[PDB]
Design a protein around this ligand. Structure first.
Ligand SMILES: *[C@@H]1O[C@H](CO)[C@@H](O[C@@H]2O[C@H](CO)[C@@H](O)[C@H](O)[C@H]2NC(C)=O)[C@H](O)[C@H]1NC(C)=O
Ligand SMILES: *[C@@H]1O[C@H](CO)[C@@H](O[C@@H]2O[C@H](CO)[C@@H](O)[C@H](O)[C@H]2NC(C)=O)[C@H](O)[C@H]1NC(C)=O
Ligand SMILES: *[C@@H]1O[C@H](CO)[C@@H](O[C@@H]2O[C@H](CO)[C@@H](O)[C@H](O)[C@H]2NC(C)=O)[C@H](O)[C@H]1NC(C)=O
Ligand SMILES: *[C@@H]1O[C@H](CO)[C@@H](O)[C@H](O)[C@H]1NC(C)=O
Ligand SMILES: *[C@@H]1O[C@H](CO)[C@@H](O)[C@H](O)[C@H]1NC(C)=O
Ligand SMILES: *[C@@H]1O[C@H](CO)[C@@H](O)[C@H](O)[C@H]1NC(C)=O
Ligand SMILES: *[C@@H]1O[C@H](CO)[C@@H](O)[C@H](O)[C@H]1NC(C)=O
Ligand SMILES: *[C@@H]1O[C@H](CO)[C@@H](O)[C@H](O)[C@H]1NC(C)=O
Ligand SMILES: *[C@@H]1O[C@H](CO)[C@@H](O)[C@H](O)[C@H]1NC(C)=O
Lengths: 281, 281, 281
């Protein structure tokens, strides 16, 4: 059984009129796997959210299914789903009644609604969060204690030089006694391997912000995820990289015409036909 | 006996030339009720201020009265009036002698001299201090412990909602479970009375700055006190309210002509004849 | 024996390419008196700097002298001169080898190289440091305990008035009871001597910044030291004062023509012929 945005109660007894409040509490995540026998309880319809008992009574007409829609549960005293800590965006009507909600943890175009604090997202690119490649490796090197890995974000320790970055073969020749180099910004640029005296280059791991490519919410809900400055080989529809990074959820049409939505650094995006395509401008 | 600005001694042994220094010490307030038998002592004339003994010897020619003028008392060793903590503005001559002083606690147009730090106030409006209506009441409401007061600044406590404001009947209908409302600025806007379930509106009490309406000190000393944003029913010659607040010390002439001194928000003030009048611009 | 910039070792084992690093460590000062038998050790050539043993082997061809040039000593393990704490400016080549160094504590035009962080100083005036006349005297005066000194920077204490300045005869007459005066900036301007009741004027001692007058390093190395706002009677080639202060290392040519290098406040400086001259603009 799929919960079509069913369990949304009033977190506090505060009156709000025509606002979009952001609440951090225990709510039922939208489109969650619900058994078909805090916790959510529904019986075909008297919905109950226990945490404090919330109740709601809605007339229904269906068989062997869960009703689709939205219903706010009211505090009573001070199908089963489980509650999780989520950040919800509640829409309060002019009478204080919650008419709609957005769970900003399920899929893209939902975090964009939280970032913009609106149920209608315009046509464009929006930077929602960032992305840092976490090092899934840890190597330590000491002279004559693990193997040397390269071309991957790894926490290294070269005879006391603790750092975080990706190692690669450098074309710089150090002096016979110098053990590590430094750039203009007073940061460790290259290190000398205590074994085999190999010179390795240190590069900071991929640091970029994620962006959602949306052709407005009035046309369709199909969005594309855009990563800035990172390669998709390190990123956890169609996967393809571009000049600005990797774009998930679009196509790689070889055509080229006028730019529609500038995603940044060359390539632009557009909506065509029921499919999002990318083209070089 | 009236002290015509008599007791003003040298607070410290510091030499100053052509300055207007502000001193916070124990001085005799100007135009104070002096007995006709720290303390001020005068005998018709050898004035003494004890606190440290200050002395002054001035030739006088009068009977059954106190001499009018100004005389600075000099430190001697390390009619009777009493000293109070006052903020005085002393005028030092080119030889270090105090020639005049202003007690900025007696009447309006004297605090203006301290605010401007000058013995000559120009023609215009000057904001000297502020004014906050202190709540002369404290009510506490709990469900089934004092009476409910409205239309007056009162400290309230609605089942744990401690605040300060004026309560009035609101036209907003809360939900059957919501107990208090909140505006866009994340402040308590309305509360629900735990008794009779009446909805009350919370409004911050009158916050405004006082202003002195003076037609310059070269013409006359008659000034008018202007309160901004407050009603004279809550404010502790002629009393009348205007669009910018309450104006004390003027008239309410129904005539209208060109503006002379803009007191703010419409109405202007002018000097006519030996009387200060107000007129809508 | 004179050390012609001989002892300069690698402070740390860090690789740098085409940079000018500033190091604070124990180095041999340039042009220092070296015996002709941390410490510097050279033998005609295998130079050794002990601190950690640094070594260097350079072919030489000379007799009864010390070789002139520059040679960087490399770390080996973990004529005699002594090491002192100095701030050196090291020039790293594209291979990490130190090719030249500047000791910014020997003479002027060397501190300018540190201030500009370059081995080539342009033609102009550069403010390197400041200059405050330290009081070489301390007098204390109490009423009926040292002699009264004037026209010299001295720490004074007049019956509890501790301060620092130069005392001189003031033409201001205090009141018979006032002991010290104060200016507009709320600072002690004048004091009354508890003995003989003499009025003295307090003036802050000479505060100014030093400046190096250099006609560029591409033409010659002869520079002139310029002090701003101080008189040479208090300052520790040809000494002469000007409108902007005292200028050491130049001439006082009475001629006057177009300005070449504005040293500030009137007088300008120029290079003529092998001699630095100053002239009123
Ligand atoms: C530390 O030990 C390693 C392991 O023997 C040394 O690596 C070898 O060095 C020799 C001498 O140059 C080479 O012939 C081998 O091919 C190296 N081994 C590998 C797997 O390449 C290393 O040189 C030693 N380092 C020091 C400083 O002694
Ligand atoms: C708390 O007690 C008060 C006092 O009885 C209640 O106020 C009365 O409520 C009844 C029921 O509606 C009215 O008929 C009366 O007119 C009310 N009294 C007055 C003076 O107006 C109040 O309703 C009670 N509240 C709760 C929540 O029980
Ligand atoms: C403190 O003592 C000194 C020393 O005697 C006094 O200085 C003398 O004062 C007399 C009286 O005016 C003069 O005739 C002398 O010429 C002063 N001495 C010198 C060396 O000039 C001083 O006046 C005394 N101060 C007080 C306040 O008593
Ligand atoms: C709020 O309540 C009033 C009460 O009559 C009703 O007329 C109005 O339609 C309600 N608002 C909404 C959005 O339902
Ligand atoms: C992105 O990084 C991966 C790392 O595996 C590399 O193989 C690829 O060539 C990189 N692409 C670009 C365009 O830098
Ligand atoms: C200050 O003293 C001098 C002394 O002769 C006198 O001439 C002058 O008038 C005095 N100043 C004032 C304002 O009285
Ligand atoms: C000012 O406040 C008093 C409160 O008693 C009220 O009666 C009056 O109507 C108010 N006047 C205006 C102009 O708001
Ligand atoms: C650095 O080393 C390379 C190695 O061949 C050499 O060609 C180059 O001249 C060196 N650089 C300097 C400044 O000597
Ligand atoms: C500079 O100070 C000395 C102090 O001994 C003084 O003699 C000289 O007249 C002063 N010169 C100028 C120009 O102020």
């Amino acid at each position: 059984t799929n919960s079509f945005t069913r369990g949304v109660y009033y977190p506090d007894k505060v009156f709000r009129s025509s606002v979009l409040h952001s609440t951090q509490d225990l709510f039922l995540p939208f489109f969650s796997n619900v058994t078909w026998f805090g916790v959510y309880f529904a019986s075909t319809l008297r919905e109950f959210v226990f945490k404090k008992i919330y109740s709601k009574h809605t007339p229904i007409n269906l068989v062997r299914d869960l009703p689709q829609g939205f219903s706010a549960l009211e505090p009573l005293v001070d199908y089963v789903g489980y509650l999780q800590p989520r950040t919800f965006l509640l829409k309060y009507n002019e009478n204080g009644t919650i008419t709609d909600a957005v769970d900003c943890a399920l899929d893209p175009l939902s975090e964009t609604k939280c970032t913009l604090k609106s149920f209608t997202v315009e046509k464009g690119i929006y930077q929602t969060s960032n992305f840092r490649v976490q090092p899934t490796e840890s190597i330590v090197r000491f002279p004559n204690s693990t193997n040397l890995v390269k071309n991957k974000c790894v926490n290294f320790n070269f005879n006391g030089l603790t750092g975080t970055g990706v190692l690669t073969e450098s074309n710089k020749k150090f002096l016979p006694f110098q053990q590590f180099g430094r750039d203009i910004a007073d940061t460790t640029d290259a290190v000398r391997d205590p074994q085999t005296l190999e010179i390795l280059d240190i590069t900071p791991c991929s640091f970029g912000g994620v962006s959602v490519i949306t052709p407005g919410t009035n046309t369709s809900n199909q969005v594309a995820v855009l990563y800035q400055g990172v390669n998709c080989t390190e990123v956890p529809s169609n996967v393809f990289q571009t000049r600005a990074g990797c774009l998930i959820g679009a196509e790689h049409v070889n055509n080229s015409y006028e730019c529609d939505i500038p995603i940044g650094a060359g390539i632009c995006a557009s909506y065509q036909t029921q499919s999002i395509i990318a083209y070089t401008m």
